[PDB]
Each structure stands twice: as structure tokens, then as C-alpha cells.
Design a protein around this ligand. Structure first.
Ligand SMILES: CC[C@H](CO)Nc1nc(NCc2ccc(-c3ccccn3)c(=O)[nH]2)c2ncn(C(C)C)c2n1
Lengths: 826, 325, 248
């Protein structure tokens, strides 16, 4: 068996959702911000936000909504986790003591159902009579909000329309009514139903179905003064309400897909819209009152306000202040002014909240030379693209290098006192026949520049037609100074060439240190690329000079230096190259038993290969034979997102289902087959999507540091900005920390009353297993924050093992010291 | 000649890697040095010498040389390790079974969640499976081990059944005691849960229905760690075993012993309301408690869902692609 | 695709056993003994008639590729029966076959099994499988005797007498190389033909074509009487050589 420890070094930073309301008091204006597994509660002031409380939940927050049922003084909070843990929460404050009440809770998962493409949707009735959930195709689940439903029991209503895009409860209806956009072979439609709690079925809805734009994406529930709904698409915005129909199709919105909506004026006169390029729009609803006294909707208008960060959620707060919740970039507070500034913008940034964004890649390098270690991460996407240099100081110090284009991979080259960064920027087919970039960015603002003239694929004779307005990715290699972080050089790769891998190393008997990049020819027609290049560059005297090129018949997904040789993965093949005295790469040996070799890692002569669906293989190079040999494979099927080698026998992997596992050689040499079976001895549900695993420690490393119980250091980056550290334990230390978890779980009160053991259970759509071989470091580190009565309750009847004293009782002061040493790792 | 199996040496194949560990022996992927065709070789070990050649491999050889169908895997030949020269008693070399190589297996494709099945994809998958099962059931062979892992699919979209190690012939006139509880718990029929031991071909049909539902939900229908719990899960959806729906349920050994919590009513049509009507009817008949009332393979092929499916169009599934990565 | 398991009578003059100096009478006797050894061992163990026959067919085929002087028959027989049991799903443990073989064999005969009987048998399985070219499925005259008899309609007792007499002829033919000369379908017809001659029955009357004097042609196409007579001659020779007479 294996024993390992996981700790959350930096908490998730990306904003996954955000709401406003009156949650802490019926009087205050609240802003609740949801980051993965984290809920942040703020109170709105005239200058900004006053933080009041933060809680963690044992689950990914999927639905977050505030409502106020008749009889309550203040808003209640509904949250549903991605594992279908539902709960209703209340804020309660006793002077200085702030706690969160679990008013109702339960798990709403169905035994049989197909998870929907557009994900979990959760909505609540304007009269707060019920909670609507769209969890599975063809089914609508209703949790009625009666006082007695403390377990959140629910029923399903058969829904004929299998493929639903979005749904909202409507305002102004005689009965609870849902309005939704759905897709069938004939296109997309908008349709209504009435929900009867008494009959437990749908009844005919208030207004007829209408055919809508093919890419109709979002439903906006218009308030009572107008009623009805607005449907947002790629090209058009339409209003529907019985006999009334409006459509505005302003050319400005066609340019970028609109992804987020919020209401500015409670009556619905003004709404806010944002798009993937970061533009913020004001949607205006023009009113017309008839002599009857009835208010109708006259027309719709769209006005461009300015630019914000690409935002997952918008929420207007008060006065001119809007909170911009960003997942791909830093989140923001911005003020909307009535008068434009001299550039034509009505939007002026107030505050900027650090979001490590998607961490596509990262490297740990001791830039200071202090032995501490700094983490430079490839963070953000598109305009929000950034390099983030992170050091420990008690908070983490983070520096931001704006790139305005997406970063893909990073590697450090000490000989050149610089980093290499792979980037992709978006250009659009323009009337010249070429392409034009939407904004300047790192690859265009380099001091010196170069464009590849390779003729390897120049024979072509393969047609790829271009239509005006289509997007293309232009991938580049950035040479960036390690002190100034100035783009010294940018090399533009070939048209339709995407950069997938990058390494810096010396090869063979060649004393020069090179940047080596692996690329693939990407054509929309091909599901899998069949052409690729391996390129050797040298960065010298401010210029990047190409040394050699190798044509491969596929995509160079990953590369890694192997004892003076270049190890590369091309599609289904793993190939090792030698570097000749003629400065040209030469094929040596190949391995083909992989469906798609996405990730590579080396230790000694051992190679860990990550397949798309076949988990990991322990390959080895036998020098005497000059060929590869399969040592062992994990036959259990998994989808890999990142792998890492812990030691010669333990191997760590990340699953696309937000899961982590550790494989070990069975080490029983009785049969050859036993050695060949990698047994999964560790299972854990991280809750984050790990993209990169990197050996190193951010915390200061000194020869004098008290040797911690933990051994080894692997840092991992995730899509939501979370950075974590994995380390190993001795059998004795694991059992102690494991036994303590079980004691802590009985003592610590969970938000929503979610069982910790369930949360960490390995979970795919098909399987759920109890966690094994892993210590939730965060749970262990929470011992220091529980009250003294609880601490002593935890240590009761707790015995140590395999130590100086075989059985040794624990006291509350003893464990406080142990955990405090465990907090020094991060 | 092509028919002289067991003489050719495994030297004629270059091993690429071990695709999977078969329960009876490991399975490796290799290339025929002469033709370049990828084939799969299953290692049969005579070293144990407890029972000599494993009977599981014996059954696969006996049966698959008889069965010819597009939806049944083809054993091409049997090859051997370099045998000891003129000393058969010292020889302990193993025998390897030549088969057609398969790009993917259904269990792996589902677990990676990398495949999205349309109705039309399922139609082509199910039609091939039933036609194969019908061929085998017409030849009076019972697979007895229908599982997601055992279904094999080439990227083209063709499906072939493969693990016949537990298969045996069925005599309608003289039903005899067979290996009890052969199928894996997730895909096991209720009759075996109750230990019929004299089961009909309908046992394989039950499993294929479990697959049918699983293709639509992308999750196995009945997942349990205990035989009783599986009966409970089945009972909730398909209804509790009761004499009215299963007149002969009382004759089954464990009927009084193994009981669901309640006498649940059938809810299959309600819980699978999202499944198309043509398919839902197939599921209701395939997942029928009484083996005598359970549909046959031919009846599934003559269903509105599958009768008008044309095998010319094999509808390849959304296969793993680099954009997906 | 599939191997040829049938030879011409003239070809048996050139079995490995013959060319090593064994005369035709001795190989014939060596076959009867080995077959009957297989039959008796499996009958003591309670084995189905197909299982006995399958082993016997393996045995007969084996000594078309090997010599009786290098492979003791009784060991081979036991090995054939052991494998047959697994092929036909009537399995037996090798130790139990040895136990029975010892019970039925004297001391000289059991000497073939050597110091370790089980080992000599289990080892040979490798050679047996390669010899029979892994063609394990075997059809036997029994199933055709019944498939064809079911299509006869007439006096219940006269047909049952025909079947049992023919069935006995099938059991006796397992001691001969007919298994190596003619497909089982022909054997089933030949034994029907022989019993009919002996019981003075005219089988055509019981067929759906009562005026088709060559009654067998509707069961087995392309069989001249020449073949059925050659077979009958070979079966009755065993009775004339021995002391046993036709069952009647
Ligand atoms: C023996 C047990 C397995 C599973 O249940 N059964 C099976 N699977 C087959 N092909 C599917 C498959 C499996 C594994 C891989 C793979 C895995 C890692 C790396 C590269 N490749 C693959 O790519 N394809 C197959 N092909 C022929 N056979 C038998 C010999 C009849 C097969 N038997």
C-alpha cells in the first residue's frame, strides 16, 4: 500500500458564480461569491466590499441562489453541489460569533438518468414555492419549499423536450411557470409550461412555442412591469410574451459570443450583458404606456459601455458599481459613469482581485538564488493571459506579467537568464485574405521577431478554404527575461501550426543549450493531426536561430530530456531520439502500445507515459538491448489530465473527473504478470482539474529546516487557480493522521451537513469508491481552528504506533504541535 | 496448410505491448511479421499441470472455430513458444491464441467518458450484437458471460463478441445442471441470482438489455456489491419477483430466502422516460423477470428499433479525438 | 480453414507404426486394445458415450501421425480420454483416470505409465493437442443414427430393434479405422443398412419416399452402395475374427 498527503497551498481563485441579496441581515446588501468549494460573503459599502465570512463546503458549488420565503425576515441560501448534495443555509450572528445554519439538506441524485449537456441548472420560483432543478435529460426535478421538507425530498416530472439549453421561472404568472429554450432536429425553440405541485405534472403553458435563433443560449426572466422573457443568441436578442414579439440584431454583438447577464434596474428597464472578448453592454428596455394605464415593451436597444475582464458572472451592486466575476482572468470592481471618458468608455476599473486563472503549465525555479523557490505559472487565457511569479512571505506574494494572449507551456533556461513561453493569439480572417489580430499582445510586442520559413509541409496540394470572420490561432515562442520579464524575442510558428511541447536542455556531446519545441499541423478536417515538427532553436545574442528540424507523422504532444537524448511522444508512438555530431535528430527506438501518448515523465531510465484512456504505463529503456520495455501498466481505465513520478515505485495521476490516484508496482516477483499490473493503491477526489504536476517547494528550503514528517514535494496547478502540494508519509504517520481525520469528522460541523468521507470518495459518473492512501491535509490543518473543548474531544483515546513508545496517548497540546509542523510544508 | 495449428512459432509475431490481462491468461498485441496484420495473442499456460490445458481456453477454441459471424471474433490460429527439441516432458512452453486485434473495448470507452452515443449509433451497435447473439443462440451455444468489458469494437464501428471462456451448449429437450451464477453481478439475470442452474438462452438477453440502458445513461443500470442488493436494485426498476409476473418463481431455490424489501411495482417506463419509445419497448421486453416471457434475440432483431436499421451504415461513435483531449 | 481427417484404406499400409516394422495385424490389434481400454476406463467412470468416442477418435488420429513403438498406447488412450472429458464437458481428474486404468490393467500393462503415471499422461497432452491440430469438435455416428431414425415411421418395435442393433455396430466400429475412412454420417447409414439386412427389414417403407429403394440417399447424398458394403464387411469381420456373433 502507499501513503500520501495533499494540502491546498493556494485556494481556488476563479469566480464560478456570484449573487446579490439580503443574506446576512434583512438590512445589508450582500454579495456572495462562489469559488470552487469556497463561499465568500461580502457586504456592499460606498467604497467597495467589506468581507464578513468565508466557509468551505465538501463539494463543488454548482447552484447558488438567494430567496426569501414568506415568513422569513431575510434571504436564505440554496446550494447544490456537483455530486448532488442539496442544502438550504442561514446566516446567524451572535455578537462576535458568526456561524452558518443548515436548515435543510439531502442528496437529490437519481438512480437512473442521463446528465445533461448544458450542465446542472437551478432556479427558484418568484413566489419561492419551489426549487427547479435540471439534472438529467428528459426530466425536471421539483423540490417544493414547504416548511416540513427538511430533507429536500423531491419528484420528477417527465419532460418531452430532451435537449434543454436554459430555463428560468417567469414573473407575472397565475401559476408557477417555466420558460426554456430547447433543441430538436428542427432547430431551437422557446416553450412554456405550468408546474402544478398538487398534480405533480406540467400543464399547458401561458404562451405558444416560437422558433428562435439556432444558437439561442440564455433565458432572461423579465420582471413584472413588462413580464415575459428575453432570449440571447449569437446574432440577435428577442423578447417573447404571448402575442408580443420583438427582435433586435445589432451588428456589434455578432462579433463576440455573449455569456453572462444581470439586472441593473429591478423593474427590468436596464440589463447588463458581457461577451467572451470582455466587452460590457447595456441592454435597454424602452417603455411605452398606453392610455389604458398598461405598460408595454416598445423596443430593445443595445449600447456598448466598455471593456471588463472576460466574466463568468456579472452582478450590479449599487450606484455605478458592478462586480465582474472572472474565471479566465482577474475579477474586478468597475464603476459605470453616466458621462464617457475621452476614449469613449463609460467603464473605469476600481479594484482588481487576483485570479491565478487556468494554470496551463508552471515551473518551479529558484530565481532569487536564496534556495526558496519561485513558481512562475502560465495563467489566464486570451486577453487575460499572464505569467504569474509566486513566492512565499503569512501570505503569498504574486507578480503579474500581462501577455494579452493565451500561454500554453513554460520552461526555464538558466544559461540564457530567460524563460521560454509558448503562446497562442487569436486572429480573424480579414478582407486581405490574411488575418488581423484583435489586439496587440506579447508575440507582436517582442523586441526582435522571426517567422518560420520551413518548407517541410510546403508541398501541400491539400485545400483549406477560409471564410471572412473565422478565427485562427497563431502560436508563438516567447523569449522572456527572468528579471525584467520583458519579451525579448517572439518566433511565429507556421500557419495552422500549434505549439504543444517545449523543453530547454543540452543533448549528446553538444555543449549548446537549446530551446526545443514540438508542434502539430492542425487542420479542421482532421480529427487527429497527421503531420508534425520537432524544432531545435538556439537563443543567442538576442536572436533565436533555428538549428535543425525533424518531420514527424503526427502531433508532438509531450517531450522530456532523457540522459542526453530527446524523448518525444507522437500520437500513438513514444520515440527516443539521439543528437548526432551533425546537429540533427536521429530515431533510435519506438513504442506503439498507446492509444494517445499525452504526457511523459522520466526518472533514471524509467519513463511514465499517460494515455488518453489507458491510465499510465511504466516504460523503461534497456541500454544493452537499445529498445523500450513495458514494465507495468494500470489496466483500470482512466482519462489522464496530468501525471507525475513520486519515487521508483509510486506514480501519481490526475483524472478528468477531478480525481487523483497513485499506482505502485505489485512488487511480488512470483509471476511476471503481477509485476506488470500497476495496482491503484491511492484514490482521492481533489475537486479540481489538475493540468500540471511539478517537483519543487515554494516554501523556503534551508539546510537548517526541521525535517518534517512528510517526505517529497510535488506542486500541482489547476484550472480554478488552486495550487496544491502532494507529499509522502510513513505508514506510522499515515495511520495517526488517518485515525485523527475520522475523529475530526465526528467533531467538525459541515456546511450543508455533507459527509467528508463522501466528498473525498473517488467519483466518476460510473463509479464511486471510498478514498484510500491519502490524508486530506486541509482537514488535518483545521484541527488548529476548532475550539479547545473540541480539540480535547478529538484526542480522547488516541494512541500512537511504531514509535519510540509503541503505544502513546495523545493530548490536545501534542497534536497542536504536530499539525503546526505540517503547516510549515506550504 | 492453414489448418495445421499449433506448429507455427510465436517468433512470427513482434509484440507491441500487453493490451490486457485476461482472467485465465494475459493478452498481448502483436504484428504478423509476414503480413503486417495486427493480431492479439492470448497466453495459455500448461505449467500449472493441475488440470493441464485450462478448460476455459478449451471452450474458446472448440466454439470459435465453429462460429463464423461478423459480430463474433475470429480465432485465426494457435502458435507456440519455441518447443524443447525432442524432449516433450521437459517442455513447459505455453500456447498462444491468434485473434483479430480490436482498437477499443466498450468498458474502457465508457469509463473514459470519451464517447457520446446517438440513437443511430446505438441502433448499429445493438443490431450487430443481437445478430451475433442470434447466430450463437441458433447454434445452441450460451455465452454466459455478457459484460461491457467483453464487447469489442473496432474504430470502423464493427462490434465483435469475444470472451467465450464460460460458454456451453444448451439442450432444450434435456436441461442439465450448469455452472451457476456465471455472469458478473452487474449484468447477471434474476434467475441466476436465484440459482436456476438449468437456465435458458434468455440469460444473455438480460445482460444485453442492461447494456442497452447503459448506452443511454452512460452509467451501468444495476451496480451492487452483493447478490441481494442487485436483486433489490433490479426489483425497484423491473418490479419485485412475484408469482403473478413469474409463475415459476416459487420453484427457484432462493425465492423465499432472497426477498426485496417491498413488493415493488415496475417503473421501467417511468425511470427511462428519456429513452426513445422504440427503444424503451425493447428494454421492457429485454429486462423481463420471467425468462419464459423474456424476448428472444430474433425478436429483438424484429423490433421497430432494430428491424429497419441497415448494417451498410454502421454509424461510428463519437470516437476519441485530439480536440476532445 | 479446417483439416482433413479421412484417409484411404490403402494408406494405412504407411502409418508410422507400419514403417517401423509393425505388421498390419499387430497395429489393428494395438488399436482395438487402445480403443477398448478408452471405452472401458470411461465406462467405469460413468462417462457419456460421446466422451468415450471423442477420446477414441483422438486416439485413432494420433497413431496416424506417430508410431505405437514410441508412444505406449495405454498412456495415449488415457490422455485422449482425459482431454475428451474436457472437450465434451464431462471432465475427470487425471488422478481418477489413472486409478481406474490401474484397476483394469495388469502389472505388465500398467508398466507403460512408468514410475509416475499422472506425469506421463499430463505431459502427452501437449503432443496430443498439436497432433490433432487443435481440431477438437468431433461428430459421431450416434447423433445421425438418431436424427435419421426419427424420420422413420412404422412399427415402433421393428425400428427400435434396428436402432439398438445399429447402435451396437457403432460401438464396435470404434475399435476399427472406419473412424478414419468415412464421415460419421456415412457410418450411421451403413449401420442402419447392416441391421436392416440382418433383421430382414426394408427401410424404404418407413421413409417419406417409400418407392425410393435407395432409402439412404435422402439422408446422405452421394453414397454408393460400394461404400456401405465395404463398411459392413469391415464391421462383420470383427465378429467373425472374434468369438462374438451378430447381436440380433
Ligand atoms: C483481454 C481483456 C480485454 C479487455 O476485456 N479483451 C480484449 N480486448 C481486445 N481489444 C481491446 C483493447 C484492449 C486494450 C487496448 C490497449 C490498452 C492499453 C494500451 C494500448 N491498447 C486496446 O487498444 N484495445 C482484444 N482484441 C483481441 N482480443 C482477444 C484476443 C479476442 C481482445 N480481448
Amino acid at each position: 500500500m502507499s501513503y500520501n498527503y495533499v494540502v491546498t497551498a493556494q485556494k481556488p481563485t476563479a469566480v464560478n458564480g456570484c449573487v446579490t441579496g439580503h443574506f446576512t441581515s434583512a438590512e445589508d446588501l450582500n454579495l456572495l461569491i462562489a469559488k470552487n468549494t469556497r463561499l465568500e460573503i461580502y457586504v456592499v459599502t460606498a467604497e467597495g466590499l467589506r468581507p464578513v465570512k468565508e466557509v468551505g463546503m465538501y463539494g463543488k458549488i454548482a447552484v447558488m441562489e438567494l430567496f426569501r420565503p414568506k415568513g422569513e425576515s431575510k434571504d436564505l441560501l440554496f446550494i447544490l453541489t456537483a455530486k448532488y448534495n442539496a442544502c438550504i443555509l442561514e446566516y446567524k450572528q451572535s455578537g462576535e460569533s458568526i456561524d452558518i445554519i443548515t436548515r435543510a439538506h439531502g442528496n437529490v441524485q437519481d438512480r437512473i438518468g442521463r446528465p445533461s449537456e448544458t450542465g446542472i441548472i437551478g432556479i427558484i420560483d418568484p413566489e419561492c414555492r419551489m426549487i427547479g432543478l435540471r439534472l438529467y435529460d428528459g426530466l425536471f426535478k421539483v423540490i417544493p419549499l414547504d416548511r416540513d421538507n427538511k430533507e429536500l425530498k423531491a419528484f420528477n416530472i417527465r419532460l418531452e423536450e430532451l435537449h434543454v439549453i436554459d430555463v428560468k421561472f417567469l414573473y407575472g404568472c397565475q401559476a408557477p411557470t417555466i420558460c426554456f429554450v430547447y433543441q430538436d432536429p428542427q432547430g431551437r425553440h422557446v416553450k412554456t409550461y405550468e408546474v402544478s405541485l398538487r398534480e405533480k405534472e406540467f400543464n399547458k403553458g401561458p404562451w405558444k412555442q416560437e422558433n428562435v435563433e439556432a444558437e439561442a443560449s440564455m433565458v432572461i426572466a423579465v420582471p413584472e412591469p413588462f413580464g415575459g422573457a428575453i432570449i440571447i443568441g449569437q446574432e440577435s436578442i428577442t423578447y417573447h410574451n404571448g402575442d408580443k414579439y420583438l427582435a433586435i440584431a445589432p451588428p456589434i454583438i455578432k462579433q463576440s459570443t455573449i455569456v453572462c447577464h444581470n439586472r441593473v434596474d429591478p423593474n427590468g428597464s436596464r440589463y447588463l450583458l458581457g461577451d467572451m472578448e470582455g466587452r460590457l453592454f447595456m441592454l435597454l428596455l424602452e417603455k411605452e404606456e398606453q392610455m389604458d394605464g398598461t405598460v408595454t415593451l416598445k423596443d430593445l436597444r443595445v449600447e456598448l459601455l466598455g471593456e471588463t475582464s472576460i466574466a463568468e458572472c456579472l452582478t450590479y451592486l449599487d450606484n455605478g458599481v458592478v462586480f465582474v466575476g472572472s474565471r479566465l482572468g482577474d475579477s474586478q470592481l468597475v464603476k459605470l459613469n453616466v458621462d464617457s471618458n475621452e476614449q469613449g468608455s463609460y467603464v473605469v476599473a476600481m479594484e482588481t482581485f487576483t485570479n491565478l486563472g487556468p494554470i496551463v503549465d508552471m515551473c518551479v525555479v529558484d530565481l532569487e538564488r536564496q534556495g526558496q523557490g519561485q513558481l512562475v505559472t502560465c495563467s489566464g487565457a486570451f486577453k487575460e493571459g499572464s505569467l504569474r511569479i509566486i513566492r512565499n512571505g503569512q501570505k503569498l506574494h504574486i507578480r503579474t506579467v500581462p501577455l494579452y494572449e493565451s500561454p500554453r507551456k513554460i520552461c526555464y533556461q538558466e544559461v540564457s537568464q530567460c524563460f521560454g513561453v509558448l503562446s497562442s493569439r487569436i486572429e480573424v480572417q480579414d478582407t486581405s485574405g490574411g488575418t488581423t489580430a484583435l489586439r496587440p499582445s506579447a508575440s507582436t510586442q517582442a523586441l526582435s521577431s522571426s517567422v518560420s520559413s520551413s518548407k517541410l509541409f510546403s508541398s501541400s496540394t491539400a485545400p483549406h478554404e477560409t471564410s471572412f470572420g473565422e478565427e485562427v490561432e497563431v502560436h508563438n515562442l516567447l523569449i522572456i527575461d527572468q528579471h525584467t520579464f520583458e519579451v525579448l524575442h517572439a518566433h511565429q510558428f507556421l500557419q495552422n501550426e500549434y505549439a504543444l511541447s517545449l523543453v530547454s536542455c543540452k543533448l549528446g556531446k553538444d555543449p549548446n543549450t537549446y530551446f526545443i519545441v514540438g508542434t502539430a499541423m492542425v487542420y479542421p478536417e482532421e480529427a487527429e493531426p497527421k503531420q508534425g515538427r520537432i524544432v531545435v532553436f538556439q537563443y543567442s545574442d538576442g536572436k533565436l536561430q533555428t538549428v535543425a528540424e525533424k518531420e514527424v507523422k503526427g502531433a508532438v504532444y509531450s517531450m522530456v530530456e532523457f540522459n542526453g537524448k530527446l524523448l518525444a511522444s507522437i500520437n500513438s508512438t513514444v520515440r527516443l531520439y539521439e543528437w548526432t555530431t551533425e546537429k540533427e535528430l536521429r530515431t533510435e527506438c519506438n513504442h506503439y502500445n498507446n492509444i494517445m501518448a499525452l504526457y511523459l515523465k522520466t526518472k533514471g531510465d524509467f519513463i511514465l507515459v499517460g494515455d488518453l484512456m489507458r491510465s499510465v504505463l511504466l516504460l523503461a529503456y534497456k541500454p544493452m538491448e537499445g529498445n523500450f520495455e513495458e514494465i507495468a501498466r494500470d489496466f483500470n481505465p482512466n482519462w489522464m489530465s496530468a501525471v507525475e513520478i513520486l519515487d521508483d515505485d509510486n506514480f501519481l495521476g490526475a483524472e478528468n473527473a477531478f480525481n487523483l490516484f497513485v499506482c505502485q508496482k505489485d512488487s511480488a516477483a512470483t509471476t511476471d504478470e503481477e509485476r506488470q499490473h500497476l495496482q491503484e493503491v491511492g484514490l482521492f477526489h481533489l475537486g479540481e482539474f489538475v493540468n500540471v504536476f511539478c517537483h519543487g517547494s515554494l516554501v523556503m528550503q534551508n539546510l537548517g529546516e526541521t525535517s518534517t514528517p512528510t517526505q517529497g514535494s510535488v506542486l500541482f496547478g489547476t484550472v480554478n487557480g488552486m495550487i496544491g502540494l502532494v507529499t509522502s508519509l510513513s505508514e506510522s504517520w499515515y495511520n495517526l493522521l488517518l485515525d485523527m481525520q475520522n475523529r475530526l469528522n465526528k467533531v467538525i460541523k459541515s456546511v450543508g451537513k455533507i459527509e467528508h468521507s463522501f466528498w473525498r470518495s473517488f467519483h466518476t459518473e460510473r463509479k464511486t469508491e471510498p478514498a484510500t492512501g491519502f490524508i486530506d491535509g486541509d482537514l488535518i490543518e483545521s484541527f488548529l481552528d476548532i475550539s479547545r473543548p473540541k480539540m480535547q474531544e478529538v484526542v480522547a483515546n488516541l494512541q500512537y504506533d511504531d514509535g519510540s513508545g509503541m503505544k502513546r496517548e495523545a493530548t490536545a497540546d501534542d497534536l497542536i504541535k504536530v499539525v503546526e509542523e505540517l503547516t510549515r510544508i506550504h | 496448410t492453414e489448418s495445421d495449428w499449433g506448429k507455427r512459432c510465436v517468433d512470427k509475431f513482434d509484440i507491441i505491448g500487453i493490451i490486457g490481462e485476461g482472467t485465465y491468461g494475459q493478452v498481448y498485441k502483436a504484428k504478423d511479421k509476414d503480413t503486417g496484420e495486427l493480431v492479439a495473442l492470448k497466453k495459455v499456460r500448461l505449467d500449472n499441470e493441475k488440470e493441464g490445458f485450462p478448460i476455459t481456453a478449451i471452450r474458446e477454441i472448440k466454439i470459435l472455430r465453429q462460429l463464423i459471424h461478423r459480430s463474433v471474433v475470429n480465432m485465426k490460429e494457435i502458435v507456440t513458444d519455441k518447443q524443447d527439441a525432442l524432449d516433450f516432458k521437459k517442455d513447459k512452453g505455453a500456447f498462444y491464441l491468434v485473434f483479430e486485434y480490436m482498437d477499443h473495448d466498450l468498458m474502457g470507452l465508457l469509463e473514459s467518458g470519451l464517447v457520446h452515443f446517438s440513437e443511430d449509433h446505438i441502433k448499429s451497435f445493438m443490431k450487430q450484437l443481437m445478430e451475433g447473439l442470434e447466430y450463437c443462440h441458433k447454434k445452441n451455444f450460451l455465452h454466459r458471460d455478457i459484460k461491457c468489458s467483453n464487447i469489442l469494437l473496432n474504430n470502423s464501428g464493427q462490434i465483435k463478441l469475444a470472451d467465450f471462456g464460460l460458454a456451453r451448449l444448451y439442450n432444450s429437450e434435456e436441461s442439465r445442471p450448469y455452472t451457476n451464477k456465471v455472469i458478473t453481478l452487474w449484468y447477471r439475470p434474476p434467475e441466476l441470482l436465484l440459482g436456476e442452474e438449468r437456465y435458458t438462452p434468455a440469460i444473455d438477453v438480460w445482460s444485453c438489455g442492461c447494456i442497452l440502458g447503459e448506452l443511454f445513461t452512460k452509467k451501468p443500470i444495476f451496480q451492487a456489491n452483493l447478490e441481494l442488493a442487485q436483486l433489490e436494485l433490479i426489483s425497484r426498476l423491473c418490479g419485485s419477483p412475484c408469482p403473478a409476473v413469474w409463475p415459476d418463481v416459487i420453484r427457484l431455490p432462493y425465492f423465499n430466502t432472497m426477498k426485496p424489501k417491498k413488493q415493488y411495482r415496475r417503473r421501467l417506463r417511468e425511470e427511462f422516460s428519456f429513452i426513445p419509445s422504440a427503444a424503451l419497448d425493447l428494454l421492457d421486453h429485454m429486462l423481463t423477470l420471467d425468462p419464459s416471457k423474456r424476448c428472444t434475440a430474433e425478436q429483438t432483431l424484429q423490433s421497430d428499433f432494430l428491424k429497419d436499421v441497415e448494417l451498410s451504415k454502421m454509424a461510428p461513435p463519437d470516437l476519441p479525438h485530439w480536440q476532445d483531449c | 480453414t479446417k483439416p482433413c481427417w479421412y484417409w484411404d484404406k490403402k494408406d494405412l499400409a504407411h502409418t508410422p507404426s507400419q514403417l517401423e516394422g509393425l505388421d498390419p495385424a499387430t497395429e489393428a490389434r494395438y488399436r482395438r486394445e487402445g480403443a477398448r481400454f478408452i471405452f472401458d476406463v470411461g465406462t467405469r467412470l460413468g462417462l457419456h458415450y460421446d466422451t468415450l468416442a471423442t477420446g477414441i477418435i483422438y486416439f485413432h488420429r494420433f497413431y496416424m501421425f506417430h508410431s505405437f513403438k514410441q508412444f505406449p498406447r495405454y498412456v495415449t488412450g488415457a490422455c485422449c480420454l482425459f482431454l475428451a472429458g474436457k472437450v465434451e464437458e464431462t471432465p475427470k481428474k487425471c488422478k481418477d483416470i489413472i486409478k481406474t486404468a490401474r484397476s483394469l490393467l495388469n502389472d505388465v500393462q500398467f508398466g507403460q505409465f512408468g514410475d509416475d503415471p499422472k506425469e506421463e499422461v499430463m505431459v502427452l497432452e501437449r503432443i496430443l493437442l498439436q497432433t490433432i491440430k487443435f481440431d477438437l469438435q468431433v461428430e459421431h455416428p450416434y447423433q445421425f443414427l438418431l436424427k435419421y431414425a426419427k424420420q422413420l415411421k412404422g412399427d415402433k418395435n421393428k425400428i427400435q430393434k434396428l436402432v439398438q442393433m445399429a447402435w451396437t455396430f457403432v460401438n464396435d466400429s470404434l475399435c476399427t479405422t472406419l473412424s478414419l475412412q468415412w464421415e460419421p454420417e456415412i457410418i450411421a447409414v451403413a449401420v442402419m443398412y447392416l441391421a436392416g439386412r440382418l433383421c430382414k427389414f426394408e427401410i424404404q417403407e418407413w421413409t417419406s419416399k417409400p418407392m425410393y429403394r435407395r432409402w439412404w440417399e435422402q439422408f446422405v447424398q452421394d453414397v454408393p452402395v460400394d461404400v456401405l458394403e465395404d463398411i459392413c464387411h469391415q464391421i462383420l469381420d470383427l465378429y467373425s475374427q472374434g468369438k462374438q456373433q451378430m447381436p440380433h
